[PDB]
Paper text:
Recently, a shortened Dscam ([name]) gene family with tandemly arrayed 5′ cassettes in [name] species has been identified, which encodes ∼50–100 isoforms. [name] sDscams could be classified into two subfamilies, [name]α and [name]β, containing one and two variable Ig domains, respectively. Crystal structures and cell aggregation assays demonstrated that both α and β subfamilies of [name] used [name] for the isoform-specific trans recognition in a hand-in-hand manner. Furthermore, the cis interactions were established by the three FNIII domains of [name], which assemble into a cross fold with a kink between FNIII2 and FNIII3.
To elucidate the molecular details of trans interactions of [name], we determined the crystal structures of [name] from Mesobuthus martensii [name] isoforms α1, α7, and β6v2. We also determined the crystal structures of [name] [name] from another chelicerate species Limulus polyphemus (isoforms α7 and β3v7) to provide insights into the conservation of [name] trans recognition within [name]. These crystal structures of Ig fragments were determined at 1.3–3.1 Å resolutions. The crystal structures of [name] [name] from both M. martensii and L. polyphemus revealed a common assembly of antiparallel homodimer for both α and β subfamilies of [name]. More interestingly, in some [name] crystal structures (M. martensii α1, α7, and L. polyphemus α7), the two protomers within a homodimer were related via a 2-fold symmetry axis, namely, these two protomers had identical conformations. This implied that the homophilic trans interactions of [name] were also symmetry-related. Similarly, [name] [name] also employs the ABED face to form an antiparallel homodimer. However, among the seven [name] structures reported here, the complementary electrostatic potential surface pattern (negative in one end, neutral in the middle, and positive in the other end) has been only observed in the three β isoforms, but not in any one of the four α isoforms. Structural analysis showed that B and E strands constituted the core of ABED face and dominated the trans homophilic interactions of [name] [name]. The residue preceding the conserved B-strand cystine always interacts with its counterpart of the other protomer.
Numbering used by the authors: -1 to 98
The structure:
Amino acid sequence: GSPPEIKPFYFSSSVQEGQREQVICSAITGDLPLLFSWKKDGLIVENFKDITLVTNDLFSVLVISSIKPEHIGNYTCNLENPFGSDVHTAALTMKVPELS
C-alpha cells in the first residue's frame, strides 16, 4: 500500500469571537481506511463544548460552532493508514473578540 500525504488546512485570517470555523483534514493519496486524531495544544479537541468532529474513513472535519478565546491555539490533525502517517498543524488566531 501507499502511505498518506496530508492536504494542508488553515483557519480564516479574520476570526471573530462568536463566528464559526470548519477545517477538513484529508489526504491527496494513501490507501483507505484513514484514521484521524485531532489535538488542540495537546488537548483532546472534541471535549470542547463548541467543537464537533465529523469523521469517516476518508476525511475528518473539525467544526467550531461558536468561536471563543479558549479556542485560540494550534490544531493538529494526525492521519494514518496501515502504510504510513502524516501530520499538519494550523493556528487559530482571533482578530476581534466579544466587544458588546
